[PDB]
Write a protein that binds this ligand. Sequence first.
Ligand SMILES: CC(C)C[C@H](N)P(=O)(O)O
Ligand SMILES: CC(C)C[C@H](N)P(=O)(O)O
Ligand SMILES: [Zn+2]
Ligand SMILES: [Zn+2]
Ligand SMILES: [Zn+2]
Ligand SMILES: [Zn+2]
Ligand SMILES: [Zn+2]
Ligand SMILES: [Zn+2]
Ligand SMILES: [Zn+2]
Lengths: 484, 484, 161
Amino acid sequence: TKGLVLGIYSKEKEEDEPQFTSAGENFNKLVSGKLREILNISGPPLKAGKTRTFYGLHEDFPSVVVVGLGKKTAGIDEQENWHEGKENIRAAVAAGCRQIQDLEIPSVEVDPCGDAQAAAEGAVLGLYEYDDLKQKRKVVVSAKLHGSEDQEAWQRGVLFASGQNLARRLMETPANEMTPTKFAEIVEENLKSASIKTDVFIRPKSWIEEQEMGSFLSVAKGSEEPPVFLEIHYKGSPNASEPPLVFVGKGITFDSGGISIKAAANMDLMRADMGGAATICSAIVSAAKLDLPINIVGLAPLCENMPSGKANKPGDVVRARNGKTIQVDNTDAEGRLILADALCYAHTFNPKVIINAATLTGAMDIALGSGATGVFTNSSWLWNKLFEASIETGDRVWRMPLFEHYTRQVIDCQLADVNNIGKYRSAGACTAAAFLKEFVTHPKWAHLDIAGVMTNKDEVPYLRKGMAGRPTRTLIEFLFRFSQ
Amino acid sequence: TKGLVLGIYSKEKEEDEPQFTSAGENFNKLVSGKLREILNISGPPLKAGKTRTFYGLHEDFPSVVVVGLGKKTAGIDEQENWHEGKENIRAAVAAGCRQIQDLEIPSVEVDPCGDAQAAAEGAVLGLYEYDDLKQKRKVVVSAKLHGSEDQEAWQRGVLFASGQNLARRLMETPANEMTPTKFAEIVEENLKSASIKTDVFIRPKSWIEEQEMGSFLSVAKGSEEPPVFLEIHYKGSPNASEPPLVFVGKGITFDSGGISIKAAANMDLMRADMGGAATICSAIVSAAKLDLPINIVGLAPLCENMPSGKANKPGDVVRARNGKTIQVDNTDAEGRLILADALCYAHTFNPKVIINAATLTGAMDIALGSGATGVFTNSSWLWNKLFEASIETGDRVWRMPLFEHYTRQVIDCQLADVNNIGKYRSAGACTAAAFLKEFVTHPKWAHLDIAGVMTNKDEVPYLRKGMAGRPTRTLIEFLFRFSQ
Amino acid sequence: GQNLARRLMETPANEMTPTKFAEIVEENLKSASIKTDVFIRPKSWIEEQEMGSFLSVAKGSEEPPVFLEIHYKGSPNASEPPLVFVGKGITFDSGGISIKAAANMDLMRADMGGAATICSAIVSAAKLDLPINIVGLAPLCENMPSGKANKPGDVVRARNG
Ligand SMILES: CC(C)C[C@H](N)P(=O)(O)O
Ligand SMILES: CC(C)C[C@H](N)P(=O)(O)O
Ligand SMILES: [Zn+2]
Ligand SMILES: [Zn+2]
Ligand SMILES: [Zn+2]
Ligand SMILES: [Zn+2]
Ligand SMILES: [Zn+2]
Ligand SMILES: [Zn+2]
Ligand SMILES: [Zn+2]
């Protein structure tokens, strides 16, 4: 069995009938108008994101799925902050591919729909499913471009989507399999497979100790699982001495909260508390695959946050790499503790920019949910580059404030230089960002709180229910544009 | 007796000693150098917002309070989105006036500190206290400009500050006194006092019924306190037919939650659930006092949300003025219910702009706290005007997303056209804003969720602990600039 | 028959009041067969019957309570003993003074499901022209908090004493 996905646009006012894409009309012409005739017989027009299946139209394609693409000239929607045409394509193609898979068809050719990269993204992201640990699995589908004219664009989409899917795999995998060491080894193999101009160092606890990363170590000690500090280098610039861009990611492989233990309900989702590490590392792997002409460094402190007879205790005071003391009032505000040391270490590379990502606060989820990643930055130039990249990818970002108003609430501390939780519950994501800022002196730093976009139910049409791997594509796009 | 407040700046690198303002140096000369001498003897220099008191320097001023103003040329802070110099002045003058009041002095003269409007704002906002119901009260202080050169600017500051204090009084007053009827009567007397070019309509229940405002009526019926729909007009434009700007404010005089009853802790603060109505009505009163050349209409639905044998019941379906049905899944999401009807009615005036304010969600507090008012708008032009105005006033605003992503979660409704609570618990402020949007078709609409700025502890230096009346001055400034 | 029960249960409580429920059941039963009788008993009858337990629940709300009594006389022998069906008809359950939590309280509009299922079954039995006598009983009211609602610890007297 071989399937075919074809697109059709919504009818414009002066048109007599809705228009097929170039590929759609070519196929219609090939079958002497039978595609149009059957679509007409089937009833109401196909709206954006909807699908309909026609059988036996051609010997090579027993199953043809037509998908609605919406308005043909849909461009950048100033109200939604994204390119609507691309989002329509990703949604439609994903829907069409899911139908092909339900029919248990192993291979499908996909209409480029006027934007091969967007089409490929919808197909690859849409078909993804983490099922390594199940006996019963859906049929494996091999999606390929229909035609031979937009090969580069199609493959670019496959590459961007594959980067996001690696992130999703890492996030979804249960914590007993996805340990700090396993995560580091998987990232290592993918980066090396991407380019030979790479270096990876899986730093052990002894190195972490030598580096005086006391804040990170305090979180790790409660668990029996060994911690590691992942450091990756991609040497893409023609000039070896060119200052690198540095990415930092929160790698808590499992967050139980520690002594300040979490409630039971849905705690399983905390296996994805290493999402910041997953997204930044995956973006670097993709940049390496594309061979972007830039130097990039990735840093990811990795460990578990568990309760035991040697775990962090509320009230304990720990010393960060930069000498600042931190009062650990709540052991479950552990992300900011491991990031304090990683951010400090990031300055040693004399980077052009420092960008960190973390599933940092439940407050961010209460704030924006899965609508957009929250971005706190001291550089409007940096905010604008991230914003522009998100418009292209559809994986949106939204700016959040970095004000002294919030800093004041974390430096007001009984025992130390800074407290790991604010004096109030208000503005949880903002006080968390203020805490991170006390460990940053760089002029171009951006903190991405991705807690709200950790998962997908049905919000992003082209992602099945599960860990989302967002905003991997936005980081890749940012890197591509920066390199140009 | 009379007190005196004088300013001094932080010393600049090239300067030999910190410099007094023009008024401070004049006073020093008047007392033959005794002020500089005593300040030197007293020790460490005065930093921004700090104060020090000197006695017996002059027969007419037994107590002189010197206040730190910070850097003289501090202008717009690109990281904080406000004019820092003005904020420094407001804080310093407020601290100085509080010291004079603690000394029980009834009159104080205030140094204009290079910006008489900011000085007056610091004095008038800083001294304010709602103490009508207390037997023991602080001395009533009469603040006046030291000198006469900048009297016009001083008077302007007193006006802006008085507008905010009216909002504070309305918000702070207990609900058994500040009923829908009382609120309307106070606004009425203040508006007529401000200008004869005004009209006030205190609409009774019978009018609300004739207007088919079923959503608003459903919230009010649970209580025995009569509801009113306050409608005010300010006819400032030279052209009577010039389209007006319309303001709408949530007026819940007390929110117990109704059948979906609230928890007891701090429920007393719900007496300020009419803050949206207070801020927009006070801004209009001030605009009228300023004699701005524009037409403005203010709309404020007012009622209590109480449990009883005839109160809204979860699952009930009500019909809004536009004919759209609403499923009331949670009776405590009452603000969006009353606003639905007010927003529909706002369109009948064929306005240029529609701006509503409301203490709408606890989620907004979790999102940004008291750092800034959240602004949801379909117009980037409108966002920029509000943002620019906020830089001047110091009472900050921060943009929040108005995406279909959030709309989808409120139109997914079991029984009606729209549900009063989202399908999920994430992004509460965003889903609430989406709900409001279903009752708006205007191209220039802005929704201000002021729940997080309802109160002040000590975040804003120049406001004592209590209801804040934010962001009244930002609305007044927006109106002033719009008229120019 | 099942869909009628679904409609009654799904309809919001501000529309599906004790009075409205009784009126819908009435029109459907009379439509089903002429061998029927419908009694929409008011509060005064409930009081005469000394139904103190039922009355204690209803008083907290301003919505009038009713005791719905329906008969289907299908047996050839008029004196044949009937089968009696009884259904709980709480049109909305807020819990009263022992108030419920907010989450999903909207579903309590279906707390009259017992009344809906037995009354609809009787309507259907009548449509089928079954040769039996049947009586349906449905006490209907809301359970709301107020200044005159049932108070924990209160003692009430049922019809049997
Ligand atoms: C819900 C989730 C994003 C919470 C963070 N892992 P925390 O417990 O470190 O705040
Ligand atoms: C805390 C406060 C802002 C809650 C609103 N009054 P709601 O109960 O109407 O959401
Ligand atoms: Zn995982
Ligand atoms: Zn945690
Ligand atoms: Zn965490
Ligand atoms: Zn009040
Ligand atoms: Zn409420
Ligand atoms: Zn409210
Ligand atoms: Zn019902």
